[PDB]
Amino acid sequence: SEQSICQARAAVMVYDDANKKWVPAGGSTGFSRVHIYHHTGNNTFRVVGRKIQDHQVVINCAIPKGLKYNQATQTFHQWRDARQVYGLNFGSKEDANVFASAMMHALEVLGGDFPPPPPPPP
């Protein structure tokens, strides 16, 4: 039981600490459709990305409470969920902003009040 909260086009990268370089996740360079998914029950989240060409899954990691998500530039973001470092090299600023905005919201919901909001603008 999952819901996509955003969809963003990006080249998905991992850092190769041995060779001191970023390498394309899954071994093949190219853009991916990168989602953040919310498990409606657990109230957990995860980033999932698939290559656009061959639909290979290149990232599939859960978003832990307390993740340090870094926007190096407006269009390259990075974090280290596990032992490796992940990067997202976005196709456009529009893509970068939606993904960052969804990630921030995910991290709030994981982090844990306010009066109800006003009506949406007419």
Author numbering: 2 to 113, 120 to 129
Paper text:
A peptide from ENAH interactor ABI1 was among the highest affinity ligands that we validated by BLI, with KD = 2.6 μM. ABI1 contains an FP4 motif followed by four prolines. We solved a crystal structure of the ENAH EVH1-ABI1 peptide complex at 1.88 Å resolution. Only the FP8 region was fully resolved in the structure under the crystallization conditions, which included high salt and low pH. The peptide folds into a PPII helix with prolines 1, 4, and 7 (0FPPPPPPPP8) contacting the EVH1 surface. The FP4 portion of the peptide binds the canonical FP4 groove, as observed in other structures, whereas the 7th proline docks into a previously uncharacterized site on ENAH composed of Ala12, Gly92, Phe32, and the aliphatic part of the side chain of Asn90. We note that residue 12 has diverged in EVL and VASP EVH1 domains, which may contribute the weaker binding of ABI1 to those paralogs, although we have not isolated the affinity difference to this specific change. Notably, a similar binding site at the analogous location is used by the Homer EVH1 domain to bind the phenylalanine of PPXXF motifs. However, this site is relatively shallow in ENAH, and modeling large aromatic acids at this position on the ABI1 peptide using Pymol leads to severe steric clashes. Homer contains a smaller Gly89 at the site of Asn90 in ENAH and can accommodate the bulky Phe of the PPXXF motif.
